[PDB]
Design a binder for these strands. Structure first.
Lengths: 126, 316, 316, 126, 126, 126
RNA sequence: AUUGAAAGUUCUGUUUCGAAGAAAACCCGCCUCAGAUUCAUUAU
């Protein structure tokens, strides 16, 4: 269940990165040394995702069926496979961070891997 | 000997740099082991290397020596401290290389009568007859205080753009804020004294004549380090520094003050100084304390106000 | 005998070096076997050799002996502890080589009345009639505590550049941070006593006269080791050291305190000392404890505050 | 009990956000650096909820049974699962803020998570 | 599958080394004694690869067909044969490192072998 | 194929020895009792060879045609006849070492024989 | 139940003594997130 939480946080970070086209929040998350830095990124990335939801540029979908998130940014279309974190996942993840900030680095490494694979595939198709 | 412990508070700081990735300039970071109520933990914290402090101290010493008429080397006149390591430096300065071991002392004296920097900060020559001289000033890395369970330090990245009327210009800079602490040691009893063992060589009389001036210049050079004139990127990222606590000890025997990690590190070091003087059969032990945070000090301790008074007292 | 166990906390450290690869200076590392809840594992951890500690102790002993008027050897006057191993050292000092086995004792006495370092730290002469003398001070490698499942140690590399106005200057330095522990033993009942079996030889009266001063100097020399004056690269990489726990035992019978690997190693060693005194028919057993981390100690144990008090108590 | 107070707080902020269709109060709460900013948001969000109660657009309910709050806004229907804070929860939360303003960031992060999940589900339906 | 994961991690390290012209990350990886050092290198090398992807200096290709990665650095062209690691490969590799840090040394030795062979071939053709 | 792998590892050790003028890595390799010691030497020797490649003091060539490696050290010129190991040879050799550390002793004995013959010939010509 | 049958080559020993990979070194020199936007029209 800890790995599932970390994977859902990584999906949120990857969606926020692909939508904003900025690595800055993922960099801040993976370099965090305090619960303050982690919590600030968790807010700021969800605030970016909230704007994408309100613009209908971020939407949940299913793809062949697996749960996925479609992201439209600057005329590029990306699809992240998996769920976004729940409020309980954020709370349980913050408790994991209060024990060991290592889990922020693990989620950041996964998020960057998701984003890199999607960006590579999108450039190859173009 | 003169041994000191200093605490500084710096905000919005970037004086030391490391290799860059992409368009990001990174700040030096190091691992630290810290003790909490739950045990021991490992953290990554920004730090500042001591080589920058040594370079600033040597530059200030060069300036003071040039102002006071003391000799300064040709290459060291420009702020390039290669000293006398390679043969090109020897050729530029015009000093013959040592022939055998017995001549090494002579070579050392020839190096020692031309540049005060080689005398104070030491030097190395590698070859058939290697010559070594350890530095008379010792510094260390600048680490924030490891007090309590939370490290009072933070690091972040900042976004910057360059304007242009014809886009075809974006970079990031790392900025840190912390409460730094560092210690230093300087033995003035060996300044202007040859270190290589051997026989007497003509030219030591001039060194004996200039010993007092060299010691005075070396003591004066610490003002730059104690004031805050060190580090790079000062043109657009000038830091805000403020002294908080300073302890200086003058002894005739080896001694090391406690690191500035705990809130009570002045009373402990004063008691340790007294007991060390008692046990080691010393004859001189003086302490000076500058306090601006209202922490415990002790009794029978001289209290100063600024750093210039400390420098004057050390000189006198 | 005097047996001690000491725990230190060191951060941003590089005092011991090994062979270098390219432009990288490496820190000594050793394998350790550690027990976890899943069994036993093998790890690679930075360590510090005991030879540096021995060199620092011998240098401090040389300084103390020179200050107190005790004889010091010509080669040992300079900090080069070749002692009397080769024939060149004997020729420089001016001591005739032993002729047969029966003369060996005489040679030992001649070595023992000229240098206190040979008496305390032992020596070796190889030849037709070899002469051996085991050191009276025993040290070991400095290993971090193997407590729990995670080793509280870390090692990394740091980047450094040398400035030059005409590029044609880049190196890396290894830096470690850990919580070190080490133990030491010193038997003062055999200082200034010949070890080679034989008949009485003129000159033992002087040794008997100087025995008290030699023992006092040997006890005093431990202050440098207990304070933190050892290792190299102190000019630019001065470490931050802080004592955490110390146990010292004085006995008339052989004894070894528990290593500082577990959090509870003072109560155990005190109980073992009491039972060993009971079982081995001893007549003297004293313990001193310095604690700064708030761990369990026990009952009926003398508690000190600094190291100078311990040194004074040991001398008295 | 601290987590229960923070959760009930989140729920109040999420109800106020869904009813007002404005993130401004949650943004102010999560960026608060003083007890003044936190207390001002706690009043302003409760004043918005009070208007929704008086209009019968905010009502307590049970849903399959879990306690919930129904919110009607601009013809959208939302349901937040959980209780609203009591007067004692507000007083105890203000005491927690006087010790550490971190708890306002925690409540803000939870509130935005609740609101985002509800908005995503509402957009998907239909 | 463990050897395939190690081989894909070695390809990532070799691509990062050839693109950055710096052995520092491979040196750190092969000398790692903790999961912290390994994870830090896995982030930093992927961050270097991400910059090369965004600049179109790192691209996936096929070569006669085998999967490959083209790397352009300082006017030199290199081709690494094989796949880059997936997010699952990074996660499974980190689990292997949590059991035995030996696998970081194995991946580092393979990465340096790939880079050395490519650098030798490029110098010979020049 | 096992003998060819051992011979290519011996060529790598001989090149590293002739370039560094140090037997220490070959001594460590031939005295290895664990996979750790063997793998550490395989890295360190390749790191020495990498510096010689970057300095253009180690280069692949053909000599009358047989494949060879030219080594320039301290104004001495040496030529080792044969190929250097591939990444696959290192991996297959490490698998042979995991079965029997004897193969490290065999490669060390061959490497010292290559180096001794070359050093003897170079001293005779001088 | 055999060129088989019947038997200890077993006892006593340290590879021990000693020696710092040490000295010298800056990642520092230049850059702006910039220009444009009404919460007002109806309510004793």
């Amino acid at each position: 269940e800890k790995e599932n939480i970390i994977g859902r946080i990584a999906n949120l970070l990857a969606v926020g990165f692909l939508y904003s086209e900025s690595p800055t929040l993922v960099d801040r998350f993976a370099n965090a040394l305090s619960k303050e830095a982690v919590t600030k990124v968790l807010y700021d990335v969800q605030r970016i995702v909230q704007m994408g939801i309100d613009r209908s540029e971020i939407a949940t979908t299913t793809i062949t069926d697996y749960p996925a998130v479609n992201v439209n940014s600057s005329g590029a279309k990306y699809t992240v496979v998996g769920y976004l974190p729940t409020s309980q996942d954020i709370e349980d993840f913050l408790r994991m961070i209060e024990e060991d900030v290592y889990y922020a680095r693990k989620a950041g490494a996964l998020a960057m891997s998701i984003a890199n694979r999607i960006k590579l595939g999108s450039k190859q198709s173009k | 000997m003169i041994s000191g412990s200093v605490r500084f508070l710096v905000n919005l700081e970037s004086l030391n740099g490391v290799e860059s990735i992409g368009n990001l300039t990174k700040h030096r970071t190091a691992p630290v082991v810290l003790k909490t109520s739950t045990g021991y933990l490992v953290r990554y914290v920004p730090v500042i290397s001591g080589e920058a402090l040594a370079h600033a101290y040597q530059a200030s010493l060069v300036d003071i020596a040039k102002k006071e008429g003391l000799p300064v080397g040709s290459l060291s006149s420009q702020y390039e401290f290669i000293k006398f390591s390679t043969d090109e430096a020897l050729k530029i300065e015009g000093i013959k290389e040592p022939k055998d071991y017995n001549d090494a002392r002579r070579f050392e004296v020839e190096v020692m009568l031309k540049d005060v920097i080689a005398d104070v900060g030491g030097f190395m020559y590698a070859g058939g007859a290697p010559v070594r001289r350890t530095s008379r000033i010792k510094l260390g890395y600048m680490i924030p205080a490891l007090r309590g369970d939370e490290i009072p330090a933070q690091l972040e990245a900042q976004f910057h753009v360059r304007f242009s009327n014809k886009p075809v210009a974006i970079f990031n800079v790392e900025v840190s804020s912390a409460l730094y602490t560092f210690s230093f040691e300087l033995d003035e009893d060996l300044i202007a004294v040859p270190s290589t063992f051997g026989e007497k060589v003509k030219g030591e009389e001039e060194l004996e004549r200039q010993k007092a001036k060299r010691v005075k210049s070396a003591i004066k050079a610490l003002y730059s380090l104690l004031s805050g004139n060190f580090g790079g990127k000062r043109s657009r990222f000038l830091p805000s520094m403020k002294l908080m606590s300073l302890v200086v000890t003058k002894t005739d025997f080896p001694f090391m003050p406690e690191p500035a990690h705990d809130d009570d590190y002045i009373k402990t070091t004063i008691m340790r100084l007294g007991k060390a003087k008692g046990v080691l059969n010393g004859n001189l032990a003086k302490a000076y304390v500058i306090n601006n945070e209202g922490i415990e000090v002790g009794e029978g301790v001289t209290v100063l106000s600024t750093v210039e008074d400390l420098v004057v007292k050390l000189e006198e």
